[PDB]
A paper describes a structure:
Apoptosis inhibitor of macrophage (AIM/CD5L) is a soluble protein belonging to the scavenger receptor cysteine-rich (SRCR) superfamily that contributes to prevention of a wide range of diseases associated with infection, inflammation, and cancer. AIM forms complexes with IgM pentamers which helps maintain high-levels of circulating AIM in serum for subsequent activation on release from the complex. Here we apply cryogenic electron microscopy imaging (cryo-EM) to show how interfaces on both of AIM’s C-terminal SRCR domains interact with the Fcμ constant region and J chain components of the IgM core. The human Fcμ/J/AIM complex shows the binding of tandem AIM SRCR domains to IgM leading to sequestration and stabilisation of AIM.
We expressed human pentameric IgM core which includes ten copies of Fcμ chains from Cμ2 to the C-terminal tailpiece and one J chain, as well as full-length human AIM (hAIM). As published previously, the density of the cryo-EM map of pentameric IgM core contains ten Cμ3 and Cμ4 domains (in grey) and a single J chain (in orange), with the absence of Cμ2 domains which are disordered in the map due to their flexible linkage. AIM engages pentameric IgM core with 1:1 stoichiometry. AIM (in cyan) occupies a groove of Fcμ/J, with SRCR2 and SRCR3 domains proximal to the J chain and subunit Fcμ5. The global map resolution is 3.6 Å, with local resolution at the interface predominantly ranging from 3 Å to 3.5 Å. The density of the N-terminal SRCR1 domain appears only at lower contour level, indicating a flexible connection to SRCR2. Comparison of the Fcμ/J/AIM to other pentameric IgM structures suggests that only minor changes in the IgM core occur on AIM binding, but nevertheless AIM binding has functional consequences for IgM. Polymeric immunoglobulin receptor (pIgR), a component of secretory IgM which mediates the IgM transcytosis through the mucosal epithelial cells, also occupies the cleft in the IgM pentamer when bound, and therefore pIgR and AIM cannot bind IgM at the same time. Superposition of the Fcμ/J/AIM complex on the IgM/FcμR structure, shows that Fcμ/J/AIM can accommodate binding of all eight FcμR Ig domains without clashes. Similarly, it has also been reported that AIM does not influence complement pathway activation, consistent with our Fcμ/J/AIM structure as the binding sites on IgM for C1q are at the tips of Cμ3 domains which are distant from AIM.
Residue numbers in the entry:
A (entry chain N): 132 to 347
B (entry chain L): 345 to 576
C (entry chain K): 457 to 568
D (entry chain J): 2 to 91, 97 to 135
Write the structure that this text describes.
Amino acid sequence: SPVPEGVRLADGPGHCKGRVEVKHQNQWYTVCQTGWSLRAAKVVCRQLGCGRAVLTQKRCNKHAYGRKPIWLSQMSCSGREATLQDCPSGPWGKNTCNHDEDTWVECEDPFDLRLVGGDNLCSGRLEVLHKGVWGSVCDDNWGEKEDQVVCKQLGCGKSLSPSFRDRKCYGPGVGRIWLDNVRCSGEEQSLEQCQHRFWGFHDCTHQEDVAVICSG
Amino acid sequence: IRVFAIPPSFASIFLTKSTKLTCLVTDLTTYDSVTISWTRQNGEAVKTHTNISESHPNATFSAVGEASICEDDWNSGERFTCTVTHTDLPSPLKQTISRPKGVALHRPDVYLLPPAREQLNLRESATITCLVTGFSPADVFVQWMQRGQPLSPEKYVTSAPMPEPQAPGRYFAHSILTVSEEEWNTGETYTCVVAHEALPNRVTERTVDKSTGKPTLYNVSLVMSDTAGTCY
Amino acid sequence: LPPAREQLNLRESATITCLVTGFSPADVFVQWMQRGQPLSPEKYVTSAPMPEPQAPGRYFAHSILTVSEEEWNTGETYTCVVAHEALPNRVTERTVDKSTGKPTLYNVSLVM
Amino acid sequence: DERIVLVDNKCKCARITSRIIRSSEDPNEDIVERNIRIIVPLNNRENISDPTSPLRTRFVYHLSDLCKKCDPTEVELDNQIVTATQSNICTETCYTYDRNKCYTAVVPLVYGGETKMVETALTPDACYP
Ligand SMILES: *[C@@H]1O[C@H](CO)[C@@H](O[C@@H]2O[C@H](CO)[C@@H](O)[C@H](O)[C@H]2NC(C)=O)[C@H](O)[C@H]1NC(C)=O
Ligand SMILES: *[C@@H]1O[C@H](CO)[C@@H](O)[C@H](O)[C@H]1NC(C)=O
Ligand SMILES: [Ca+2]
Ligand SMILES: [Ca+2]
């Protein structure tokens, strides 16, 4: 049986949304396996690295030009397993695609962060990308532990504890306060891996923002 | 011969994300000469999916036939009908289905009732109750969870909506979950997820636990000071 | 089941549940009486027998009566008389009230 | 370690903890305890952002509006992820000040005739500009 070389998610806005297109040896075709739970969508999203699977559904075919043939094996995958290579597949046989429907999948935008307002980077206001928008992080709880996690992710070195005397050189923000009550205990790898309140809910003002100055 | 055609409720639409139509046929004799057909309002045919189940104690056969049409056509108000032909029946049967229109939307309330005190003295089992009420129309989906993982369906039973005697146009339903007494005394947590069309976000959640219930002790303490004008 | 406290807090009505299980065969009749006087059939809604998935051969049902908040607060009593052939006297009763519960305490401390 | 914090309000300085004590040995005879700790200010005024407001000598503490949850949570349904409303109940008065917050005011300053309004610090230290 063919081994998937990759997934591309064509016919969708960007490459984190669209129709599931398994790369068959040489020419590739669309797949409509039954029991398409979110577990397989999570592995599909992890193939591209977009982020977390949010939704999967099969859409009615009304002159959608589904020229791509269909596969002949199932892909029962536990979701916590590795790439599509390491999940069992049926021994060829017939297809489970009775109703002619395309499989849809909706991944999420990847995370990103930066410092704005500081010279030669490694300093300034904190902006985090989510839902395709940048925003500020509240300073209600900003311990020294929460400062070093941001610094190493951008490779700016250990923070030098600049206090608030030089934190007035960046000013306030205008964007939405995405994060609040951030509590980072361990190093982890990303700020999103910490415990926060929620995306979009806060009790802060643009005057109270977070400024992080690393070594550089 | 009896033919039942159930429409797809919004509860199925929420989870399956697919609108399918089923025409249950009961008391069938010859399954080699039957045809489950689905047609639109003009006469166009729709591709069907007929599956024949196993045998029955009363020497009858059950016919299950799925027809799939996506929600854009169905929610617009178009009418469908089911036809079952049999070589023993001189005339094919016609059963039509469609979704009603013109009903107001009222937000439902969620109530969780802890188990009775006189039940846990037997050291046998407990019973938690999830109550949803005052909602229109009569469509509701209730599912229980524990630690973020769905429970086995048997552990709980959900009933159909019933009218409310004191308020016209409003209904209610119930859900019952059974758990061990030692599990409840340990301090595990449970969750009742309720979905209805009239909710602001379409999904609501409540949680019950032994610790956060009715306390026997109310150790209230009040401290007065003339200098503590701020609290960290 | 005593009525929900939050339902009373919002001050519309109260919900009294009569949960009866563990009877066989499927033959049960529940009624609602207040102060020894049976209430009208239009006061409660009666469920229907249906098998218990856990233990086969057992059926169960329930009945709910809505009461006014002031009527519930005034201290009126309610009961759920049940009838079953297997019962010794064919009549069993369970009764609750507002006072039905366990006595609480208040260890108030005032630090002047 | 044996207590769990439910609410940690700062405006009303209210804190509620719950704990189960294994009294005796029967599992059905363990008491559930609820502790409430309230610190009341005797010098703060009606409006904490206006020094001219009169003094406050009446405090009301509703426990139904204190132990309330108002933040949508994520729920997995094996086919999608949805946001769920915790409570349906969701202008509150702040009795005491908050350390994590800054309180400022506008005051007229006259010198040589000209009047220069300047931002003040009602709180002693709080945060810095
Ligand atoms: C308590 O004091 C505040 C501050 O004076 C009042 O809110 C201010 O109202 C003025 C106009 O009257 C605005 O210029 C300020 O922007 C307001 N402050 C804020 C933070 O927005 C508030 O109305 C007072 N409360 C009462 C009950 O009088
Ligand atoms: C009363 O307070 C004391 C401590 O001051 C505590 O030991 C006792 O348990 C409290 N009473 C109750 C009924 O909780
Ligand atoms: Ca702050
Ligand atoms: Ca905060």
